């Protein structure tokens, strides 16, 4: 069982790994230390109704705007996602064009699975830990914005319960990237063949790190499947946002908030 | 593209 | 556990050759010309479809375009749910689950089992009499012309993985005891089935797959790209609201 | 849905 070709796949998961530690400052373990109050400098105001919501600032064209805004303040994100898949071994070989395919999909799916790590049943992080949006006040807002996160509170909340930790996420995060299946892509085998070997090494990956964890392997790549109907439906957010009939003033700070999401 | 297909090729070159 | 899990593919696969009277086994064989049957009539051209037009047409029976493969459809949602009783546990479900399992299962059992009625070439039709051609559907004007190349790319890459009917018939198992349908009520029933489903597939394709790598993971990858057809096809109905009428109800009865 | 009422005479 331990042999030169298990070995190969913790070399790899090491490697990505640390290139993972590199690429994103922003990791589960420190999501979930700020979650459990463990983070002196980054001590979240909870914002659970209007009322918290006043207190909290120190700091539709409205929907629109926020998705214009969040899809702006994801830059970074896109650059780290970017910054770790040439990491991973065989993505820079590949077509240029297929690399742009992959990153283009997958960094949408890679910032909800690390929007997960800043969720937990009750809220999610905002402003870079320093606020604490709650889920029901999010879901308690006027149509359309009650529903924008809903779905991806749902989807954290299964999501972390598989408790993966950022040993599990880099590798699983790399599978995201070279998905086969993206429109588009010119020459399906080369991403293929590297995917095949992030599987291998996610499911060495799993086994040694999840003994509980019955079928854990295929209930992360079910993940996958929760991942892409989420963007999918986004799609269909705008839709709903085309023929929506309604002014009101959303609060600024929660447009601003909104803008901090996904 | 998009403006994200021109934010990942700066990003990759 | 590992005779356990041998068993429960045999029972999967013994309800699915009760279920579905074409299996993938019967459609290679019809495909490949194995078979001592007559080669099945082809549609690949206008000549063809018109000389094969009483063969295709409703005997049985702008979004009427569909309602033929609708119709048709029928008889795979009844053998799918048929099959879904033998599913161990399935039956012990809350019915309405079982409903919406099944309501949102069996568009992704239908591609799949498209698919093993497909080659590069074309598609089965008329229970594996007809062969209608891949380019002949791709030769109808647009937006016609677009509606099954989808389904055959899918099908292409999904039959190069090689499944047989034993396979399919966990497979389809599996989606079926999906636990992320819409309005699911009770989903921890339905994913300890799927979870000993899943064993069971995995043990299967280790087994009579031993050397396809990643086979497992790449088949739960295809859920994915089913959904993604089962979606593109709301989209599909869009583009048909903003648009020959009788000869493309036959033509695409028989498909999906 | 005309499917949910085939699929429940199936079920039954
Ligand atoms: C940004 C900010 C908030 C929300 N939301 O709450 O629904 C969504 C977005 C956004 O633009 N998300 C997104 C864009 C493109 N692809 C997938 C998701
Ligand atoms: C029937 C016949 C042809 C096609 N097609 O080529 O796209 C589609 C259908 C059909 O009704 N497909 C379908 C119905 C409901 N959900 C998913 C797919």
Same mark, same amino acid.
């Given at each position: 069982?331990?042999?030169?070709?298990?070995?190969? !796949?913790?070399?790899?998961?090491?490697?990505?790994?640390?290139?993972?530690?590199?690429?994103?400052?922003?990791?589960?373990?420190?999501?979930?230390?700020?979650?459990?109050?463990?983070?002196?400098?980054?001590?979240?105001?909870? *914002?659970?109704?209007?009322?918290?919501?006043?207190?909290?600032?120190?700091?539709?064209?409205?929907?629109?705007?926020?998705?214009?805004?969040?899809?702006?303040?994801?830059?970074?994100?896109?650059?780290? *996602?970017?910054?770790?898949?040439?990491?991973?071994?065989?993505?820079?070989?590949?077509?240029?064009?297929?690399?742009?395919?992959?990153?283009?999909?997958?960094?949408?799916?890679?910032?909800?699975?690390?929007?997960?790590?800043?969720?937990?049943?009750?809220?999610?992080?905002?402003?870079?830990?320093?606020? @604490?949006?709650?889920?029901?006040?999010?879901?308690?807002?006027?149509?359309? @914005?009650?529903?924008?996160?809903?779905?991806?509170?749902?989807?954290?909340?299964?999501?972390?319960?598989?408790?993966?930790?950022?040993?599990?996420?880099?590798?699983?995060?790399?599978?995201?990237?070279?998905?086969?299946?993206?429109?588009?892509?010119?020459?399906?085998?080369?991403?293929?063949?590297?995917?095949?070997?992030?599987?291998?090494?996610?499911?060495?990956?799993?086994?040694?790190?999840?003994?509980?964890?019955?079928?854990?392997?295929?209930?992360?790549?079910?993940?996958?499947?929760?991942?892409?109907?989420?963007?999918?439906?986004?799609?269909?957010?705008?839709?709903?946002?085309?023929?929506?009939?309604?002014?009101?003033?959303?609060?600024?700070? !929660?447009?601003?908030?909104?803008?901090?999401?996904? | 593209?998009?403006?994200?297909?021109?934010?990942?090729?700066?990003?990759?070159?």
């Amino acid at each position: 069982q331990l042999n030169p070709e298990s070995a190969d !796949l913790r070399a790899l998961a090491k490697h990505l790994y640390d290139s993972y530690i590199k690429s994103f400052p922003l990791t589960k373990a420190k999501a979930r230390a700020i979650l459990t109050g463990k983070t002196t400098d980054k001590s979240p105001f909870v *914002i659970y109704d209007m009322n918290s919501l006043m207190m909290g600032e120190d700091k539709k064209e409205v929907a629109i705007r926020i998705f214009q805004g969040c899809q702006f303040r994801s830059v970074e994100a896109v650059q780290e *996602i970017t910054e770790y898949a040439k990491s991973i071994p065989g993505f820079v070989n590949l077509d240029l064009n297929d690399q742009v395919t992959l990153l283009k999909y997958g960094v949408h799916e890679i910032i909800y699975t690390m929007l997960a790590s800043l969720m937990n049943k009750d809220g999610v992080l905002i402003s870079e830990g320093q606020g @604490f949006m709650t889920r029901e006040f999010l879901k308690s807002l006027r149509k359309p @914005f009650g529903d924008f996160m809903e779905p991806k509170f749902e989807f954290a909340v299964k999501f972390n319960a598989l408790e993966l930790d950022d040993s599990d996420l880099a590798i699983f995060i790399a599978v995201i990237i070279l998905s086969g299946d993206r429109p588009g892509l010119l020459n399906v085998k080369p991403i293929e063949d590297i995917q095949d070997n992030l599987l291998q090494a996610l499911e060495l990956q799993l086994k040694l790190n999840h003994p509980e964890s019955s079928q854990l392997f295929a209930k992360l790549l079910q993940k996958m499947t929760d991942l892409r109907q989420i963007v999918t439906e986004h799609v269909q957010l705008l839709q709903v946002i085309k023929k929506t009939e309604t002014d009101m003033s959303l609060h600024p700070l !929660l447009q601003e908030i909104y803008k901090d999401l996904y | 593209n998009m403006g994200l297909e021109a934010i990942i090729r700066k990003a990759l070159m």
